[PDB]
């Protein structure tokens, strides 16, 4: 038993809720919150800009040092950094960005990063301003992630559609 509240059970291990992921993180203080990152860890908008704003830009400062030392991530890759005031850790995961013309197939590789963590609070990878179909992202999530994932979906109308169309 954990502290996530009001989630809907989709499968044995995947749960979903209409909520702002930053607000969920503040309340639950999960061990791991997932960021919808890009390879440069430039957190300007969407989930990434949201999480970074809530950290008062500390996430961006830490990320800039990470990139200066290690260089960019790979599309489909990830790194673990601090969760600051939101979580113990932030797993920065890079899903493909269709609006950048990136390869849709890398979405499964991106979700495989979640399997390294027993429990995560996460967004749907490649959705929103990354350009992919959220219904597809949810399908790849359920078919790839074996650990316990609590998905926060910002948009109410999208949430309702994700639940109603889930196979
Ligand atoms: O971009 C966000 N989310 C994504 C989104 C939005 C629309 C359609 C989608 O498919 C997706 C995928 C993901 C989701 O499902 O939420 C987001 C932005 C700000 C925020 N917090 N915030 C607001 C103002 N200041 C801070 C929280 C989330």
UniProtKB/Swiss-Prot annotation:
It catalyses: Thiol-dependent hydrolysis of ester, thioester, amide, peptide and isopeptide bonds formed by the C-terminal Gly of ubiquitin (a 76-residue protein attached to proteins as an intracellular targeting signal). It is a multi-pass membrane protein. Residues 1-167 form the Macro domain. It is found in: Host endoplasmic reticulum membrane. Inhibited in vitro by GRL-0617. Changing residue 164 to L: In strain: Gamma/P.1. May form homohexamers. Interacts with N protein. Responsible for the cleavages located at the N-terminus of the replicase polyprotein. Participates together with nsp4 in the assembly of virally-induced cytoplasmic double-membrane vesicles necessary for viral replication. Antagonizes innate immune induction of type I interferon by blocking the phosphorylation, dimerization and subsequent nuclear translocation of host IRF3. Also prevents host NF-kappa-B signaling. In addition, PL-PRO possesses a deubiquitinating/deISGylating activity and processes both 'Lys-48'- and 'Lys-63'-linked polyubiquitin chains from cellular substrates. This is Papain-like protease nsp3. It comes from Severe acute respiratory syndrome coronavirus 2. The gene is rep. The chain holds residues 1025 to 1191 of 7096 of the full protein.
């Amino acid at each position: 038993v954990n502290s996530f509240s009001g989630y809907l059970k989709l499968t044995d291990n995947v749960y979903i809720k209409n909520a702002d992921i930053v607000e969920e993180a503040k309340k639950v203080k999960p061990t791991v919150v997932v960021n919808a990152a890009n390879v440069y860890l430039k957190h300007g908008g969407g989930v990434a800009g949201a999480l970074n704003k809530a950290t008062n830009n500390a996430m961006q400062v830490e990320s800039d040092d990470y990139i200066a030392t290690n260089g960019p991530l790979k599309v489909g890759g990830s790194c673990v950094l601090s969760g600051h005031n939101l979580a113990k850790h932030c797993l920065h995961v890079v899903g493909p960005n269709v609006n950048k013309g990136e390869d849709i197939q890398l979405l499964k590789s991106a979700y495989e990063n979640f399997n390294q963590h027993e429990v995560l609070l996460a967004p749907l990878l490649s959705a929103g301003i990354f350009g992919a179909d959220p219904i597809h992202s949810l399908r790849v999530c359920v078919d790839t992630v074996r650990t316990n994932v609590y998905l926060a979906v910002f948009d109410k109308n999208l949430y309702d559609k994700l639940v109603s169309s889930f196979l």
